Design a protein around this ligand. Sequence first.
Ligand SMILES: [NH3+]C1CCCCC1
Lengths: 248, 220, 323, 229, 52
Amino acid sequence: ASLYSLMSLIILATLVGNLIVIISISHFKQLHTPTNWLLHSMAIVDFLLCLIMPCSMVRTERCWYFGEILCKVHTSTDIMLSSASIFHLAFISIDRYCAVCDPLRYKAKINISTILVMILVSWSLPAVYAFGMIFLNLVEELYSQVSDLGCSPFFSKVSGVLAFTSFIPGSVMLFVYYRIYFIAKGQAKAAKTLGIMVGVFLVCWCPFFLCTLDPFYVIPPSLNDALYGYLNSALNPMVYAFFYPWFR
Amino acid sequence: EDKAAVERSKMIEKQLQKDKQVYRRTLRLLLLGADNSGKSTIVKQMRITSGIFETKFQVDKVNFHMFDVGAQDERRKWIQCFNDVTAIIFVVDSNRLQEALNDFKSIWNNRWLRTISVILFLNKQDLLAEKVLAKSKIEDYFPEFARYTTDATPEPGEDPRVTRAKYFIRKEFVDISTASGRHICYPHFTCAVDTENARRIFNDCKDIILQMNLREYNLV
Amino acid sequence: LRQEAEQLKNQIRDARKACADAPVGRIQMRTRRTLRGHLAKIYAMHWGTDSRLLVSASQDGKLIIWDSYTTNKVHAIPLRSSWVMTCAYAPSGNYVACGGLDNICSIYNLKTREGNVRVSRELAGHTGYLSCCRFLDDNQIVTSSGDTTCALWDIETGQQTTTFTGHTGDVMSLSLAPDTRLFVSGACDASAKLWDVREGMCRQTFTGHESDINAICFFPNGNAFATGSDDATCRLFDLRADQELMTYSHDNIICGITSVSFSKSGRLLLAGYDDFNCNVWDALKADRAGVLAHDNRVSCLGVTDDGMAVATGSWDSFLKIWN
Amino acid sequence: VQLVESGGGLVQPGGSRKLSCSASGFAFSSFGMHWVRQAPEKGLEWVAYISSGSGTIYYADTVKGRFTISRDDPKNTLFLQMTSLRSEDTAMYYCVRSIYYYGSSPFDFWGQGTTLTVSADIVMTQATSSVTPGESVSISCRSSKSLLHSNGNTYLYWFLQRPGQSPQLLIYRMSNLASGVPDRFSGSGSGTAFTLTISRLEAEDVGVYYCMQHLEYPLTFGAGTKLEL
Amino acid sequence: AQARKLVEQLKMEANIDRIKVSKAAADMAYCEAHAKEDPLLTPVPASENPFR
Ligand SMILES: [NH3+]C1CCCCC1
């Protein structure tokens, strides 16, 4: 009971929060800037992530009573919708890296036409890759784990390496933020904002993906449960839209 | 019917959007040189009864539009129109230098140019080198000239007494009204004829917009 | 000479102070349309005689003519000079006049056999920046410049018909009369002068404001007008009485006035201020009952000839119509 | 402002012909373009309509799949290509200029035109086709539906095609007369019944007068009253 | 010169007919007789409102 409420607490916070980037922006022309649209689309992404999040609240009844039919679709949706979050964060780092490392051309190569390319790629590649690899995930004998009780996505060396590209955004973010730290520190805070932005991402994503170690399997559902990122998604707007005056 | 009027409005908004992309890229600058200052000289080197004498150039692939002023003796009212320029650009001959300090300070601490940075150009220091060497003493005009001492390295190839006055006027300008945070002076030494004027503007504007971006993202 | 001028000024003051004999409610004017599409700050607008079309000018160098009812953009004119501090719309609707910091007034022919709005005349001859221009007819136009001199031009000839001289500071706005015989114009010398169009000479001078006048309007009656200046005060000056009436100002306002306008009945004096907001007053009592809330300095103001609505412009690139 | 139409000739039935309208003297890129048919022994009829930037196209219900319209703004020209020319598509085709904004005058200018050899819409009719110079004359027109729209416009157009020359515009939206027409033409109506009044009468007013509607998209013309005086 | 023109203008503007302030401020009256035709002072009902 306590675990269910604790986990579920982030769903409503996520839903109420993204309303902000949606309601501050689509009403807005005070904030119609190309940069805003990325936050607008990511708020949509995390909002979707009403389908997954309540379902995973029920999923943790250690059994997927909702039905074996919905299994692959539900899993494909989480990968797609989170790969979507990451990629959005990656492109946000990209646009912030052509605003503090190239500020004369910041607007000429970051604009609504480029932003629509960055949004379509982020909604396409995760979706196509996840649905293609949830209906070719895998070693079914090992899946016995998947086969025994009914559900949670799990992978194997064949596909675990491909699963954990998504974590390319990390290299882009680290390169971008070490350059941004170097420049901002040279100018004269930068340190606090950068540290919190990189840390919020890292602390959530790193352990689950590192364990996803399993193909070389002591990871039980008892302990893999907390590893399943949702709280990071609950927090992304807060870091990326509220700390700076974009809030209004 | 009426729907065709809506189509016309949409097709006009289409052109407005395609012109918004050109209004963002170009960086607007306002030139506010003095009467005797060599601002005409600096705008003459642009290969790189009217009112505004606009001049468009491009350092590398970035387009700057410098708005010079023609037949406009009071500026208390037509200055507020330049609230959206990237930067002001003063030109000063470094006695008429005190008037340059006065109007420089008055441009600072206004109500409409609070968020606009300033690029100083100290044009015609070629005459300043001879003035420092010979007869004309800045002590009479400025009592603190004698007390002031030079340690930022100057450009080699000149006497230590000819590059010691430059820093005096530079310091006087930079502490005229900058030291009251959102905008600060960017002093320079434009001399008489140098081809680095555009680069001194390009790097300056790059720094200005970088600082603006850092302030929006809260990097500072 | 100076002693005589001082004596004349004292006599004038005594004569205009000789006699001194002597609630609308919350308007809550709600925005109905929002004419978005301008890429830079709005400087000036002008309504139409039909009360349907309006024209606005932007720092981009764009003069956009909007259909207020249906929000459509009837016309989009690219200006030669990006810096435009005033615009006009002809009473017949065939012409628009834009004037700004280029010291040249451009008259564009809206109704032409071609499908482009071309400039019919480039009236040059002023020295200072143009700050207000208004049409008398399709033939003659009165312009306000920053060189302390107003002017009256004949468009087809392209030359000044008369020059109105006498101001000390740069003249910021002018307002016509319903009869179009006399016109008032305020300047930076903290004075507003009534001029006679026919004789090309100053008729009266009104003082009392502390700072430079940045906007002037004229009462529909024909014998009164109102001014807006940078000292956050508006004043109603009688024209035929040469006096100062009740002053519309508040202790909570520290920013000056950028534009002024009247309602057709004259019961409402609308004032576009600098603090991102346009205020209203009961012109017969000077009570602020209603506020027209933009995101930047409200720079322009207009009221339709039938009083249907009031349009407000501001430096947030937006132009809002309120009823 | 002048439009030169090109095409025409002796064409066997079932063929294909691409007629052109070269516009010069105005901003063709900003003016919607219509085509209007006129049989040798009948009144006018609408063919097709293309918007200013070709963002919207309408075709006549009589022939819709065989006709195609196009415009070239950089060259300021218009094209109408017809295929499988039946025995009815052998009439006089006029390319018409028409811009649409508040206060505008659609159908203001009509081209020279070229010859050719081989339902639920509002129908506009006239009392007759015939009516001495020097006294006022009146022409009556009727519509199958109220042409007065909710906004207030009454989409009725009068043209007065004079013999030996292309048609022009007298009065647009019922009430507002054209620019170059003499100030002796007036129009009034209630929504379905219309009347056009001419005070004087000269050697130029002789001709056939047409009655067009623009409320609904199909543009049905009238019959034409031939005033001989 | 410049002083003479100002003196002449002041003399011309000094001889101007003026009336009592109470009479000049009573035409308020223009507002009274023209108030009913003001859509702004008196709100237009939502049947003839042009910007409804
Ligand atoms: N829970 C999911 C997070 C992203 C990678 C696949 C597993």
